[PDB]
Paper text:
Compared to our previous analyses of AP2 by SPA EM under identical conditions, a much higher degree of particle heterogeneity was seen with AP2:μ2FCHO2-N1+N2+N3, likely indicating a decrease in stability of the closed conformation due to the presence of the FCHO linker. In the range of particles observed of AP2:μ2FCHO2-N1+N2+N3, there is a contraction of the gap between the solenoids of ~14 Å, yet without the movement of Cμ2 out of the AP2 bowl. A key residue known to latch β2 and Cu2 together in the phi pocket, β2Val365, is no longer occluded in the FCHO-enriched SPA reconstruction of AP2:μ2FCHO2-N1+N2+N3 when compared to AP2 alone, further supporting a destabilization of “closed” AP2 when FCHO2 is bound. Since the EM density following N1 in the AP2:μ2FCHO2-N1+N2+N3 chimera SPA is located adjacent to the highly positively charged region of Cμ2 that includes Lys341, Lys343, Lys345, and Lys354 (47) termed the BR4 PtdIns(4,5)P2-binding site, this density can be assigned as N2. No EM density for N3 was present in any of our reconstructions.
Proper operation of the pivotal CME cargo adaptor AP2 requires membrane-localized Fer/Cip4 homology domain-only proteins (FCHO). We dissect the network of interactions between the FCHO interdomain linker and AP2, which concentrates, orients, tethers, and partially destabilizes closed AP2 at the plasma membrane.
Numbering used by the authors:
A (entry chain B): 4 to 582
B (entry chain S): 1 to 142
C (entry chain M): 1 to 141, 159 to 222, 240 to 255, 261 to 435
D (entry chain A): 9 to 608
Write the structure that this text describes.
Amino acid sequence: SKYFTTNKKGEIFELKAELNNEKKEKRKEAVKKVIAAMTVGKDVSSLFPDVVNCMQTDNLELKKLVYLYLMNYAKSQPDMAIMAVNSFVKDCEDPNPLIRALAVRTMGCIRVDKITEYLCEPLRKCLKDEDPYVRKTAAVCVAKLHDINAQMVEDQGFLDSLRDLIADSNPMVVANAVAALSEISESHPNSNLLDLNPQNINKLLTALNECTEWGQIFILDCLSNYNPKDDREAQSICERVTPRLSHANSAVVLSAVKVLMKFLELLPKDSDYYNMLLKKLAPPLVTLLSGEPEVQYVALRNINLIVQKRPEILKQEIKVFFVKYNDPIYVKLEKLDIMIRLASQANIAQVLAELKEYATEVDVDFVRKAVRAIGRCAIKVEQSAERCVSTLLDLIQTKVNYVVQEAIVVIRDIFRKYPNKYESIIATLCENLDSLDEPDARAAMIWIVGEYAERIDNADELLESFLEGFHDESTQVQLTLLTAIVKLFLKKPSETQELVQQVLSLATQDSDNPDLRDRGYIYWRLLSTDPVTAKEVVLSEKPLISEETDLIEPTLLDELICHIGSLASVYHKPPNAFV
Amino acid sequence: MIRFILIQNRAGKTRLAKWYMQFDDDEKQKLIEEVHAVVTVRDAKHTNFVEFRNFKIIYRRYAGLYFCICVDVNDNNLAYLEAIHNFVEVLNEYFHNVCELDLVFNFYKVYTVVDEMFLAGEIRETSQTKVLKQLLMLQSLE
Amino acid sequence: MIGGLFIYNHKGEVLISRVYRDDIGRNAVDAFRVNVIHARQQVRSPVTNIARTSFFHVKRSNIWLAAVTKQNVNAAMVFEFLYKMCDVMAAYFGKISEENIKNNFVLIYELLDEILDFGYPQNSETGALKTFITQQGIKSQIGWRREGIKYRRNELFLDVLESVNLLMSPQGQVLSAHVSGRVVMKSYLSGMPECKFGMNDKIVISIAIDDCTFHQCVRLSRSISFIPPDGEFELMRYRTTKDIILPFRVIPLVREVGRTKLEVKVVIKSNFKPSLLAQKIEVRIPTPLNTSGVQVICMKGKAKYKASENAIVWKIKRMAGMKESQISAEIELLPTNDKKKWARPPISMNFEVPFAPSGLKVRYLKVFEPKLNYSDHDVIKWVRYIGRSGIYETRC
Amino acid sequence: GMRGLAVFISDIRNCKSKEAEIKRINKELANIRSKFKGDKALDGYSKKKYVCKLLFIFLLGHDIDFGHMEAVNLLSSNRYTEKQIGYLFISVLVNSNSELIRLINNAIKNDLASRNPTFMGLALHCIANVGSREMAEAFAGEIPKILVAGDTMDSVKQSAALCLLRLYRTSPDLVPMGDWTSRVVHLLNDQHLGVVTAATSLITTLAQKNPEEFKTSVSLAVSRLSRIVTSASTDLQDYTYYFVPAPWLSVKLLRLLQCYPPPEDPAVRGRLTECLETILNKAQEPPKSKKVQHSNAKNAVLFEAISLIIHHDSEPNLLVRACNQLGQFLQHRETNLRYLALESMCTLASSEFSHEAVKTHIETVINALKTERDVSVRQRAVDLLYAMCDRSNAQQIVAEMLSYLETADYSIREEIVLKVAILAEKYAVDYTWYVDTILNLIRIAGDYVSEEVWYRVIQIVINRDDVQGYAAKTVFEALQAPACHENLVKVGGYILGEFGNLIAGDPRSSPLIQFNLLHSKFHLCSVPTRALLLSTYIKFVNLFPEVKATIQDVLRSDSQLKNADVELQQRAVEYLRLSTVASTDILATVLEEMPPFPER
């Protein structure tokens, strides 16, 4: 398609003509227009040679602009960027070392097997430089070179120089060097991870007080790789890391908390430092939740693990985790989980105060999680289940459908947890029979009727009401209805006989569900053979239920504590799961 | 019948927009944006016959430009694609290897060419040579 | 560590992107545009894991800023870097908007090259980068309610009444889709209550255009601050055209056995959670004019044929979520007319679902009375989403 | 000269910011308004330039609230450029000031009254482009007279024909049942081919609602078609397009013939048939140019002729030739031709005469489906396969669909699964094949199959199929893979729990192996799946005493007795009590034959 391609006249021809103009201002304008046209998607590859002719200019603005242009092509297609290495290598006597940094990072952008020969010498000769930014860019370029899987035997000297960069005046240089070393050391070659621990740690901790915030992040993350052998070194490291409460919203605080939790192996009987550390770890985690919603979400996901490991740190801070209206939904849910985990014996008196208020909010799923949280509080503490039941009945009387459905769902679980302890409640629930349409709430109500059947005088009518529209219902509802009717037949023989045929010879053979058919036939056979065995096989004493939901694997918990500050805690998954 | 004709670029800026069916200005902008979004996704290997609302679009690429014509679901697609190519050839011969910019500085000439070749949502004339002769005699008249 | 930095507008087009690691390609951009911006079944989260790709996304006004990674990196550090970069960009060129971003591509490339050094979030001090960055940006410059109203019990009902319009190709490609809805606030309140009503970000302020027309009593600053007039009133009206969750999905299959026979099988699938139940399901299947007779069979609901409307009417009282049902009709055609095959009009269907097809969910609603001590806790709030069907048609 | 427009456009395109562009637009608009507001009127050239500038500003998307007065004033000018620019500006910007409509109607009437072909052509173009109700009411009675005028030349006749087309499309009631029908019908014999094209389009549109009026044109059209296809390469030199004589006119004539039933006169029917196979044979000839454009142009006429043949549906030989020609297009390097051929063959698959010819290409359709890249082409191929599927080749098509599913992607699996299920429903003859196909479909893509399908397969297995051993073997061979998922787990649990005794002889299918498989499944199963597996477990308790002991330890752990869900816990309690209390007699009693349901 030669149409609209001719370069004699057009936008590309005009840009090329402007690029060759003698005045540098119009050249800069042309380069800016070229960059904009590239960004908006217009193909301006045919302008590549002329802009390369702009390399040899004393002006720095044009040189910087063409550097950004070449980096833009570097990640799009490396082959186009290869044709500029001849101009790139002019990086020896050029003043203003930021130009050297830009050049070496531009070589860092291009990823080809052909760039190794032309980069080894400039990288080697720029690491030992007086300007700190050139040292920075050399340090990051060594890591980017090590990113590929190759030997590049000069890489040994590269890593030797990188390790030598730890003893440098500028904190940012050593911070970038240690960050690059950490990024390189994820895989361990034959000669790496040397036992140069004491002096390197001393230098890192000395420089930490002067490093930039991100430098502090890098150093403290690298400290998580170290493991101590003597308690004196651990105590010194902890007491030197503790003053880390900088302006960073969570990064510095979270990484320092990671380090302190990792360096937690002492004795509280004689050393009055474990208790003091647990005491002063609270204010940082409390003040983390006064920032921004995303940072608050990350801090909450870390606090979940911190509380799960050592609950005594946040024992008396249930007030700060109260949900504000203006926070997003994820922060609300995580704060709800934190409140549930911290529901001790003494704070319930206010916790149920908050969880009752959350059930009147206009957010449906948040109210659902709030009533489920009320149920979780009831399950956790056996001494406060009566207050939880009273609150749930209060919510039930409010007559809101999305509240009532999950409230009665929770009532089913509470009745399962403490049987024959809230008998007087059930009759009230009988009033809310026609207000349930969700499968979960309907199943919960049917099961509640099935058990304690002798305490309801009109349970036969309640079951007959649902039996009419047996079809067009979920499998859970059908199975629960079958189980409840069979349970009530044994509890109430010779009054509900007509139910047995209507449920077995009509709601089993007509249904196409295989598992439901098997259940119906098994129930028919057991009832036809002898009710004596049916009573003792169906009405067996159901054991309690374990609260394993609010529990995590101790080894997995230890791994997550080893990875507090990173994405593993946010996902609550091992790093091996996402390789 | 032809619904609308568009000459676009990768930047999304419309360069020709002929509308044979009534629409509001914001409606026209929405339709142009959606057409550009649909066209720019497909590559060369993909078909040129893309369903779009209760219509379809026949489009082709020429260097830095996209040509699109919107037709009904029951019209011969290849005929309209060849009409697109014929219109492109007429423009190219009339503007002496037309470029993208020549569709802006001579937008009224583009409009009169489109009206000469397309009218009332159908194909008016198909012969390049005497269409060009008509255009030259029109240009000669002052 | 940090893979790449992307900046998008509300539409989902890549305003400006810059990748630092070669292992990330166009797949990351496509995944972030598809399953994050246009996510329907998932509750929004700042971090997203997609096929071994971690997305950190921050929304500022109407601009999405995303960081794509493939390693195990400090999440808090990445979020703080995003915040600091947003602050620096705001310092350079004021408000962060689509026009401002498009006006300063050179400066945004400058910043992404300077502060973000190959996944390493270096210093973002405004005074430190003035020497480091040379280019400078370009900046852009009571009556409806009485007094003394009293009620025995303060209450308010919200009804989000939406109507979904769709035209679908037979192969499943969505040709056209939009939702036109309104908010009805039946409020019985006493005094001069100031109401704050905050929502999610699904609404941004012959064919449909995305728009939102408010009421006179509302004010904007996200949040809606107003004073509800007594009785029943319509809070706002809106018309969205992007990211419509579809309560139903219709697959028609027609086989023309010769000219005297037709076999039409229509399968309806429910694309919502199993808890929700859709009521009043009516499927209208078009029928050829020269229809001698029909044999129509369904395993769910009831079906029949109407010669008054010349259509198969298939009524289902209720349907659950994530369920599929089918209707099968064998039609015998008498060729009274010669040739000129019958053009098939689209298959229509009407339904009602208890959830907004636009994805709108009300976040918070408070009432504050500076005259009497009662607050949002004392008032009873009801919320009801009702999404009906407008012109909901799928070609057969 | 025309220098202001170029400078203005260059300044606009060079603006660095949108605010600066808006400021420039506002400044130019204010300058134009001030110039036109002045009492001193200037020459027409300045007005023409300013109107063109206003049009360019409106084209950028800005709003213009004036400019129509001088736009109308430009129409009265005898200079052609001013009239053309004014007409274009009026066409682009629709105005609703009734006085302006009166002015433009008067100007258009004056232009039409003039004998200059260019001015009347511009007026017709403006009327066709605007096409408002007022213009229709003004010129509905005038356009046909211009159309049938013998002194009007060819270009004005084309423009008037298309203007009448537009008026009829926008105002059906203003086009009467006039006496100009004979003249417009006979106009198709004009030497100028473009006039024939315009008249053909007009007749195609008008014949949709007035068939009995334009019937006599049909035969005439056929004649022209012959004179289009029998012409040599040196004929119609003006109307040739890459060695093809008048493709668009041929297409339009074919549509016109499609608008009407087959002619009753045998002579014209024979002539059009000869033209049809002439087109087909010309398509069968090797290309005269290696360029894609000539092939596209010729295939346009080919596809339109095929569509005409389908619409007529009267010549079995023509249908067979069209089917063969389409089959030659499936193995075409291009994709547009492949898509069009697939669509046309899908249309043909609905005709009795060409059904065998469609079924002949089953192998090439399958090969095209297997080796395609675009999703749309694959979907069209699958729809064609469903349309052409029949009892003669149902097994082959179903097997090929499943084989494709083994390596297919997620963009087509839903449709493939649904079609396979429906075909197995409709064309099942022997129970063994149906059960095997359904089970294989489950094993491949159960996550997309409906619940009723695997209810029905279990039902038919239960009632009477004497293939229980084969079904159990297939289930067991399917369940030993890590890629299994929920629906396969459910159906496998039920089938095993009911017929595990038939494969107990094989040492590779020992009860311990079955239990290990099911327990491995448990790690990634949902609540109803677990309930079905527990039912299967008690079935095995009743059926396999040797494994029974190790079942009890399964039905006593914290995962069963302390399960959060009430249903699973209750099932575990019941099954543990049944296994422990009483003896094997009760479990034998609860496992009956479950006789098949009565059949009506």
